[PDB]
């Protein structure tokens, strides 16, 4: 009864953290690209307005 929980939790956590390291590898560009658009586009917007 103890062993069932032991193996389940151990393998589950190993897989969870390993796949978490795999997954967390993918995102860097969304917010940065948006912000780096508006940062140099605010002056253009003000030009348009005025």
């Amino acid at each position: 009864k103890e062993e069932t929980k032991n193996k389940n939790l151990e393998e589950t956590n190993v897989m969870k953290i390993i796949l978490e390291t795999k997954q967390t590898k993918y995102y860097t560009e969304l917010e940065q690209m948006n912000s780096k658009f508006q940062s140099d586009t605010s002056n253009k917007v003000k030009d348009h307005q005025f």
Binding site: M33, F37, T41, K44, D47
Partner: protein, 47 residues
């Protein structure tokens, strides 16, 4: 794709609008000279 094309569109639009602003300023000062000339023509006519 949404970023680069729109930013280049706006960078060209800046020139597009500034051209018309400069030409509007030219038409405005030519209007100023024209109205001044008409008013001075009236001045001389009355004299």
């Amino acid at each position: 794709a949404l970023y680069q094309l729109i930013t280049e569109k706006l960078d060209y639009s800046l020139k597009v609008l500034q051209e018309k602003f400069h030409e509007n300023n030219s038409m405005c000062d030519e209007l100023k000279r024209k109205e001044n000339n008409f008013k001075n023509r009236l001045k001389q006519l009355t004299k």
